[PDB]
Amino acid sequence: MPVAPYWTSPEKMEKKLHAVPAAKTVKFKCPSSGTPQPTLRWLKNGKEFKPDHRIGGYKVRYATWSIIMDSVVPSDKGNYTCIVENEYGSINHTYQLDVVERSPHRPILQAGLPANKTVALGSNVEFMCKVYSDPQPHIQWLKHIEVNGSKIGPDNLPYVQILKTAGVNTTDKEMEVLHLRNVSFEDAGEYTCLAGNSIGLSHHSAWLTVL
Amino acid sequence: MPVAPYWTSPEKMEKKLHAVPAAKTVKFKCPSSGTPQPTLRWLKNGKEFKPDHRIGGYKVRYATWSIIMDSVVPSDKGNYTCIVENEYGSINHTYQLDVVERSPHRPILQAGLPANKTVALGSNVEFMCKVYSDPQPHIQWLKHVQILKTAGVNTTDKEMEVLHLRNVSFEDAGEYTCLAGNSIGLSHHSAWLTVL
Amino acid sequence: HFKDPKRLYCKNGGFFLRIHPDGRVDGVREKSDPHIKLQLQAEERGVVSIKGVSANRYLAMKEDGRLLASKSVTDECFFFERLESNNYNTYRSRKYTSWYVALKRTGQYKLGSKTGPGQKAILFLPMSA
Amino acid sequence: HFKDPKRLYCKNGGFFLRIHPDGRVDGVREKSDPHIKLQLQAEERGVVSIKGVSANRYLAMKEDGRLLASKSVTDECFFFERLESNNYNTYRSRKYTSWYVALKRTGQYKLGSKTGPGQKAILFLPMSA
Secondary structure, three states: OEEEOOOOOOOHHHOOOEEOOOOEEEEEEEEEEEOOOOOOEEEOOOOOOOOHHHHOOOEEEEEEEEEOOOOOOOOHHHEEEEEEEEEEEEEEEEEEEEOOEEEEOOEOOOOOOOOEEEEOOOOEEEEOEEEOOOOOOOEEEEEEOOOOOEEOOOOOOOOOEEEEEEEEOOOOOHHOOOEOOOOOOHHHHHEEEEEOOOOOOOEEEEEEEEE | EEEEEEOOOOHHHOOOOEEEOOOOOOOEOOOEEEEEEEEEEOOOOOOOOHHHHHHOOEEEHHHEEEEEOOOOHHHHHHEEEEEEEOOOOEEEEEEEEEEOOOOOOEEEEEEOOOOOOOEOOOOOOEEEEEOOOOOEEEEEEEEEEEEEEEOOOOOOHHHHHHHEEOOOHHHHHHHEEEEEEEEOEEEEEEEEEOOO | OOOOOOOEOOOEEEEEEEEEOOOOEEEOOOOOOOOOOOEEEEEEOOOOEEEEOOOEEEEOOOOOOOEEEEOOOOOOOEEEEEEOOOOOOEEEEOOOOOOEEOOOOOOOOOOOOOOOOOOOHHOOOEEEE | OOOOOOEEEEHHHHHHEEOOOOOOEEEEOOOOOOOOEEEEEEEEEEEEEHHHHHHHEEEEEOOOOEEEEEOOOOOOOOEEEOOOOOOOEEEEEEEOOOOOEEEEOOEOOOOOHHHHOOOHOOOEEEEEO
């Protein structure tokens, strides 16, 4: 009873796009059937896909009509097509793999920013702070203050003045640059850029010298 | 025809220990059979194992007599036992899961070592260097250079973490450095020997 | 880049969290969907408000655990953004501390009152857009 | 700790690399085996000699790709220890640069002449002992 290949479990193929964090094991299934029993081959981006194409290779369980890849990395990113075929026909299905590399560590500020600035009384200075964080970082700008001689208080924490704080009222858009319009000898002092996530906290400081 | 549960594929069970790098998907199979058809339940370290016991949970394909875990983390490390049972008997099999987190970075030297040393002419000073590396590190000692010690079959790691300077002299004064590297990168800490 | 919008791909079904301009919340696998670009903003360490860029509304968890997108920010618009050990993110209601933003295998949001840690529905993967 | 012996668990079958005191090389799943404790020593960056602690012999790759454990160190006793992107280690012969130390699904060493990068047999996982 000649039969061209056909999908036996189309329900298990609805998820065309596979997005995952790097290092995850990926398995693509193309449950099909037909008589005579069809052949199963895969293609990475439309080309022949041999197991030496990736470290550790990959396993093809024919009884499952699937392909499995361990610890997927960005180079694995791409389209994979299964081709089930026999003498009376062939069927194919493509999956899209997308691997994301995370970063479970506190925010990282670009070294060198903000940078110390020396300017003339009345100038318009603006500081920068380039942050990097996988999980959303909470940025904030501070100025260090002296109440008498001390820049540090009773509790041994530095006195500060919160100048900018990210949030709905101040979107990340404007959080990377601190604007100081028309300075004065008063504005001189240390300015700090703080950034933190649930993992940890980071901060870079710079000094504003006015003359 | 009453039959107690029995393994249908004991050949697929020989691997009792499953050691893997974190993030890998793990699946444990206990292919068995019997009539009436037995029930399959799993136990993490001998206790009831509900899917809420781990993020993302786990899938139990009964048709395959297997349990599957996605992106395994250290907290998953442990013993898992399958329990196949019916009215006439029960069989069980335990697997051991071991998850390894890798450290793909160049060697790390303990901060503060080697430390500066000030000594009297003729003393016997010895420096230290505490290294850490997942892949085997190649350690070496230098004097500011002069290669003083280098790891290898002739000088095993055993003796490579401590540099011995027997009875010094004003000559021996100077900066000594401890280098360690793997295929990923290189590291090194320096110290100063002051002689008097 | 944290400043840009992100697309939240749910591990449970491959559904992207979607915020309709009318305030409705659900999922869709179609990456080109106009309403799935979200702007995650931190209100403080480990806390974010999820704003639908197209709909200009904020994802909110209600007392009974149903999701919707508010026009303006209220106290139900904040979640604990946590990067779990499996490398997936979870968004826990800062107000209803034991419930997560989650999507069912069917593409519909799952009630907070029904979400748990061992659930595939609570896991999302951020994707830059 | 790099100074201590390590057990090499092969991804292909869960076989631990074993060095018999008589110089034979093979694999075994039994973690309590007396001849599986290895002492990896670096000769230089990314190059190691694998010494069987019990057998007091060094793992060596022969011209034809067969494994054995030499009594004293020769030029075939060095390998490129590389931590691959999948988080598994691979040991490539420094002398026969295109072959790897590998174990078959049967528990027997696999001929270098037959080893490739896409092979599950060449992947090992270090385990402190």
